[PDB]
Design a protein around this ligand. Sequence first.
Ligand SMILES: [Cl-]
Ligand SMILES: [Cl-]
Length: 162
Amino acid sequence: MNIFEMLRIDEGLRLKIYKDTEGYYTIGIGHLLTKSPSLNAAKSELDKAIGRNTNGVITKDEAEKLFNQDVDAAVRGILRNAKLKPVYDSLDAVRRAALINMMFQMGETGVAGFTNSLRMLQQKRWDEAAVNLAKSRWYNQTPNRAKRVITTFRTGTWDAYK
Ligand SMILES: [Cl-]
Ligand SMILES: [Cl-]
């Protein structure tokens, strides 16, 4: 197991524009297009991303390509952040993947608000962090996924993905 397989499981794969759990236009493997309620705006963003007139539909290869870029950007987003980097650096390889998944799902900003849980993760207080992470809109809104990530932080293994 790895980051890619992990998120592929969490986000699925769709080749046609769709609305995510928050109702935003997305495509591929959790690739957010826009927070705009406009579909045309979504189509436009999609075409811009792909480099062609897609008409709201892409190929598997294209999805994969967005996905690789998005994973890469997430990691970089972490590394570029002064508050995130240190956390990320203190962790083992499995736990890091947990951190990248949250980052992918929620962006720098969302991740930002877990300051307290982050401190705990940094101190290696596993069970406490798991408890703190659970006290969040994030857990209340996407419980099954949240549970998978949380277990991952808690145990340092991939058991929730097996
Ligand atoms: Cl893009
Ligand atoms: Cl969920």
